[PDB]
Amino acid sequence: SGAIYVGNYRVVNRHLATHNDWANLVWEDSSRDLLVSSTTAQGCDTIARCDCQTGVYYCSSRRKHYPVSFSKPSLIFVEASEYYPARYQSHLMLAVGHSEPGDCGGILRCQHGVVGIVSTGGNGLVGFADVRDLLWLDEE
Ligand SMILES: Cn1nc(CC(=O)N2CC(C(N)=O)C2)c2ccccc21
Ligand SMILES: [Zn+2]
């Protein structure tokens, strides 16, 4: 589990969104595994606006933050899980690292701020849903 709290937005994995998230929906995209809902309080996270390929992510199944090198956001084939059939997921970045299903939501960050959240995993891989192209998170 986990979310990004920027401005009056809450960014979560679409597959982990709650009823309150769907009832206060701003935007969702199943191909990216992302959903954004509105919040009453302002958040403290800052979004990175950069092309970094190195950063650090939080792994809840290890209680640890790990430094990683990650690929550029792309269209990647992801195996079937409890939440999606086997399919192509867009705006996804891969790194070598530990991930279990419940690790979804952990933040990946670089020197500029939040880059994305854990979305996929398996066999020493971890996938991150990028948010750096969502410029509207910084306004309204
Ligand atoms: C974080 N992660 N995820 C999965 C499968 C899963 O629940 N999916 C893949 C997610 C998606 N965005 O399509 C939903 C896994 C399987 C072993 C290890 C780590 C893992
Ligand atoms: Zn950066």
Distance CA 53, CA 63 (A): 23
Domain count, the chain: 2
Residue 73: DSSP 8-state? S
Pair (57, 106) in one structural domain: yes
Q: Kindly state if the Cβ of 5 falls inside 6 Å of ligand 1.
A: no
Query: In this structure, are strands 54-59 and 64-69 parallel, antiparallel, or unpaired?
Result: antiparallel
Pair (118, 93) in one structural domain: yes
Q: Strand, coil or helix: what is 2?
A: coil
Q: In this structure, which residues have their CB less than 5 angstroms from ion ligand 2?
A: 48, 50, 52, 110, 112
Beta-sheet strands, E only, within the chain = 4-13, 25-29, 34-44, 54-59, 64-69, 74-78, 87-96, 107-110, 113-122, 125-130
Pair (40, 50) in one structural domain: no
Pair (16, 61) in one structural domain: no
Which atom of ligand 1 is least distant from the CA of 129?
A: 12
The domain in which residue 52 lies consists of 45-140
Pair (35, 49) in one structural domain: no
Contact 122, 100 (CB under 8 A): no
Task: Give the method used.
Answer: X-ray
Pair (34, 51) in one structural domain: no
Pair (91, 73) in one structural domain: yes
Q: Strand, coil or helix: what is 137?
A: helix
Pair (12, 40) in one structural domain: yes
Residue with CA at minimum distance from ligand 1 atom 3: 120
Pair (28, 92) in one structural domain: no
**Resolution of the experimentally solved model in angstroms:** 1.4
Pair (28, 55) in one structural domain: no
Pair (30, 63) in one structural domain: no
